[PDB]
């Protein structure tokens, strides 16, 4: 009698055969299915309710019954036909962790993480057939996120005067649950739902240093936190997390691939803040064409080529859009590019040739070379994001923003149509270092979360 | 019940590759009820269906409206009729005490509502045959936005094709009544969108109606500001924003089902301008297919978001971001481009004061202390002010000292935010060139696109 034998294990906290992965327990489920055939739903509930040593917990007994229902009716030849049994049991299993004193909760914690990974993969595959199953997009994964969110809400820290140092299972998987939930929100194209998860993470944590969590869970959290910040156009906030996540990673081929994932975001984020990587240490994580691609953009930005930056983004438009990088790069890269273009002008005009007054006509000639074609010009009669923003006519506007961002120490004389800088040979007095100026104006949230 | 088939089951696949090796045998499982979390608006045209009693009952209400000349007697007659109607409609399963609700009101305003508004004297002159008529015209009255408790009856809600008919009537007859009719049009257009929500309908009629209503909102924004007629800018933009959210949601659902909407790019572009500084809309637009992202209207809107972005933009709850362009000069150049769609320009006129303030705020920081006041002629051309009176009023609002009545002393600008604490916002304004473009076209042509 396998059904009685299974119930004996579950009643005593033994969950060896309590899984949805038939690759692990298919033989026992096959025997269970044959023996359970013929018993209706009421009898399966009676088997659990009447079983000796069964915990007197409604949710635990509901969980056991749903597994028996799963075993009886599972169709291994159809994932879709069995999905309702699988998803129903998973919800029942997670409900067994909501109460912090639920029976066998500590033994259930490894089962819940193991089953969560199974159900997340299955929900993703089912969602890809949303048209055929007549379900809305991301319906399966969004349901999982709903279940995992409720488990997240039920996690609380012990008292401030706890009698022991014990870390309960719910606290042990807190960051694991956070990363799983935020990964789902990114997958279902609603990453702003991470906001609640990020805000309530630390208050629920009993550890009072973020570095006490597992390093791999630390790195993924910073990766997702940086991506969330970058989606809000908060570049410096994202950079600090991206930079700290990658440095911790440097201290498996999956680790190498994960490092590449950070780099895809860290490189453009650092570039906006006037920081460029050393390509040497990055070789194990990046293919040579990736290095060459960013190096071309590095060349355009470093020497103040506005048209080159626009054309580079145009070439890379599709894959930048897939990572939500196109808009932030298109908006916040020009001012770094403009600073470098203006810096070279002042280096020759002021520090070398001694002229502290810069006529606007000189800047317009410089800007005409850098920007090139614009929406108004012949040959480009339709507006694009690549020819519709920058125009050499707007000399004063370019200078004003550079000054207002702290990147250019200068005075503007609109009636005289000239720009006045300090009389010096030291260029850094007129054009200070970019990264220091930006980070001083926009301080970031500390890399030390707590 | 759950979907069991041959094609779907084969496509989704098995749980494991070879179940029979593990001891499983193929069993004919009974059909199981669909789980609660897999329950699923309508995206395709449905044929209009009306219950025979509902059709007969509505025809009696119209007949009684013609026969009973006393206003209060007719209303009380239809009141007791409506009480009978609700229970019968409840018994038929066509209204709740889920039901796929279908509206069956074939007028632009339900007959019961017409009689009610006769008693409350809330009928507009636009809804009467003649101004002094005691009765609301059946062919002119428009259903108001419902502000109730009981669920609306089928006779209260217009079906999608009647909703299109109502908007067609508004476009053909009521656009030229602006700005006087703005309160009427805003409420009636809100009701048209409400009826679609009542039926949970997102078919082509809902897309077409929401699209043209959004266009009407953009036309209204310029007409009210130009005519200096007092109105709630907030209420006009809220409904305009809500209709854009609805359109985005229908565009998403249509894409998921494999269809297309011809006008999606135009209204994705409008949505990019509803919250010009919200990074959310930059994120969402990047997810869309290439042909939507690269459409000239979307590209134009994206340019405006870039030029308007400012690292000094100051407002409670707004997070400043790095390296923003603050390209006010480019903004006013783009504003004057003949390739700028007129309704799109009407949307962007909402930010004229904000862009102007931060232009003066940024320029003043580049001036040294000895610098003379900036001549108005320079600022008028740089900020595209309509006339000398507008720039004078602008400087007065922000306490910018005016010297000799023709120059602004920019160092006297003490505010760091466009929004003043204990003051009403500056009177909204417009651009002369956009007004001239409006006078060279028709309202109907703009709304119909």
């Amino acid at each position: 009698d396998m059904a009685n034998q299974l119930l004996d294990e579950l009643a005593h906290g033994n969950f060896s055969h309590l899984t949805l992965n038939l690759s692990q327990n298919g033989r026992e489920i096959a025997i269970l299915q044959k023996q359970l055939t013929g018993f209706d739903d009421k009898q399966l509930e009676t088997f659990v309710e009447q079983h000796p040593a069964m915990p007197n917990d409604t949710r635990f007994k509901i969980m056991c019954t749903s597994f028996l229902n799963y075993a009886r009716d599972v169709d291994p030849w159809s994932a879709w036909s069995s999905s309702d049994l699988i998803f129903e049991f998973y919800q029942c299993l997670i409900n067994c962790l909501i109460n912090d004193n639920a029976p066998h909760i500590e033994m259930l914690i490894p089962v819940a993480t193991r089953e969560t990974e199974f159900i997340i993969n299955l929900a993703g595959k089912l969602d890809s057939f949303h048209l055929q199953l007549h379900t809305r997009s991301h319906q399966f994964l969004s349901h999982i996120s709903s279940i995992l969110s409720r488990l997240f809400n039920s996690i609380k820290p012990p008292r401030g005067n706890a009698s022991s140092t014990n870390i309960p299972g719910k606290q042990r998987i807190l960051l694991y649950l956070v990363n799983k939930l935020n990964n789902i929100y990114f997958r279902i194209e609603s990453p702003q739902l991470c906001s609640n998860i990020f805000k309530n993470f630390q208050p629920k944590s009993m550890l009072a240093h973020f570095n006490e969590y597992q390093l791999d869970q630390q790195i993924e959290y910073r990766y997702l936190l940086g991506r969330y910040y970058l989606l809000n156009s908060q570049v410096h906030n994202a950079f600090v997390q991206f930079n700290e996540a990658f440095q911790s990673l440097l201290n498996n081929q999956a680790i190498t691939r994960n490092g590449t994932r950070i780099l895809n975001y860290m490189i453009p984020t650092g570039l906006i803040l006037g920081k460029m990587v050393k390509w040497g240490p990055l070789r194990p994580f990046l293919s040579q064409e990736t290095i060459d691609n960013w190096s071309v953009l590095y060349k355009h930005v470093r020497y103040g080529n506005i048209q080159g930056v626009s054309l580079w983004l145009r070439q890379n438009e599709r894959h930048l859009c897939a990572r939500q990088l196109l808009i932030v790069l298109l908006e916040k890269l020009p001012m770094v590019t403009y600073r470098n273009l203006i810096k070279t002008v002042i280096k020759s005009w002021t520090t070398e040739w001694g002229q502290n007054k810069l006529p606007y006509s000189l800047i317009e000639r410089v800007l005409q070379l850098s920007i090139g074609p614009t929406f108004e010009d012949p040959g480009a009669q339709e507006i694009t994001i690549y020819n519709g923003i920058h125009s050499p006519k707007n000399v004063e506007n370019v200078l004003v923003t550079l000054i207002n961002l702290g990147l250019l120490r200068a005075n503007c004389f609109p009636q005289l149509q000239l720009c006045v800088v300090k009389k010096t040979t030291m260029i850094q007095e007129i054009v200070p270092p970019v990264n220091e100026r930006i980070t001083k104006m926009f301080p970031a949230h500390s890399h030390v979360l707590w | 019940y759950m979907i069991n088939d041959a094609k779907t089951i084969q496509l989704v696949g098995p749980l494991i590759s070879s179940p029979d090796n593990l001891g499983f045998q193929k069993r004919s499982h009974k059909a199981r009820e669909l789980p609660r979390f897999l329950i699923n608006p309508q995206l395709e045209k449905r044929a209009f269906v009306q219950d025979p009693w509902d059709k007969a009952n509505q025809e009696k209400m119209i007949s009684l409206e013609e026969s009973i000349d006393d206003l209060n007697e007719l209303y009380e007659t239809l009141k007791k009729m409506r009480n009978t109607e609700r229970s019968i409609m409840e018994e038929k399963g066509l209204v709740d005490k889920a039901i796929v609700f279908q509206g069956t009101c074939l007028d632009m305003c339900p007959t019961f509502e017409r009689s009610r508004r006769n008693v409350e004297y809330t009928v507009y002159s636009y809804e009467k045959n003649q101004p002094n008529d005691k009765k609301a015209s059946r062919t002119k009255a428009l259903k108001v936005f419902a502000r109730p408790a009981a669920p609306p009856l089928p006779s209260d809600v217009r079906p999608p094709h009647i909703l299109v008919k109502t908007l067609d009537y508004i476009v053909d007859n009521l656009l030229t009544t602006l700005p006087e009719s703005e309160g009427f049009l805003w409420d009636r257009m809100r009701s048209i969108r409400q009826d679609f929500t009542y039926q949970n309908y997102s078919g082509p009629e809902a897309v077409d109606c929401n699209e043209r209503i959004v266009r009407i909102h953009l036309l209204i924004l310029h007409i009210m500001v130009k005519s200096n007629v007092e109105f709630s800018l907030q209420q006009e933009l809220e409904q305009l924003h809500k209709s854009l959210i609805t359109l985005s949601e229908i565009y998403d659902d249509v894409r998921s089902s494999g269809g297309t909407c011809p006008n999606e790019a135009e209204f994705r572009a409008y949505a990019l301008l509803s919250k010009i500084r919200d990074p959310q809309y930059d994120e969402n637009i990047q997810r869309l297919p290439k042909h939507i992202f690269q459409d000239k209207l979307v590209q134009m809107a994206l340019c405006f978001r870039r030029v308007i972005s400012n690292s000094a933009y100051t407002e409670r709850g707004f997070v400043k971001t790095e390296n923003c362009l603050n390209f006010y000069a480019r903004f006013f150049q783009l504003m004057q481009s003949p390739s700028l769609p007129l309704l799109m320009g009407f949307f962007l006129q909402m930010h004229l004061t904000d862009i102007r303030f931060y232009a003066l705020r940024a320029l003043s920081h580049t001036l040294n202390k000895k610098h003379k006041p900036i001549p108005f002629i320079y600022l008028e051309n740089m900020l595209l002010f309509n006339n000398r009176q507008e720039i004078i009023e602008f400087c007065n609002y922000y306490s910018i000292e005016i010297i000799n009545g023709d120059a602004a002393d920019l160092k006297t600008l003490q505010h760091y935010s466009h929004k003043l604490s204990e003051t009403q916002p500056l009177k909204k304004t417009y651009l002369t060139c956009l007004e001239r473009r409006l006078q060279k076209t028709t309202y109907k042509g703009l709304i119909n696109g």
Binding site: N404 | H365, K370
Partner: peptide
Amino acid sequence: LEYSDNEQEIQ
């Protein structure tokens, strides 16, 4: 006519 710093206003 010379450069006068306005970092206090800028920052």
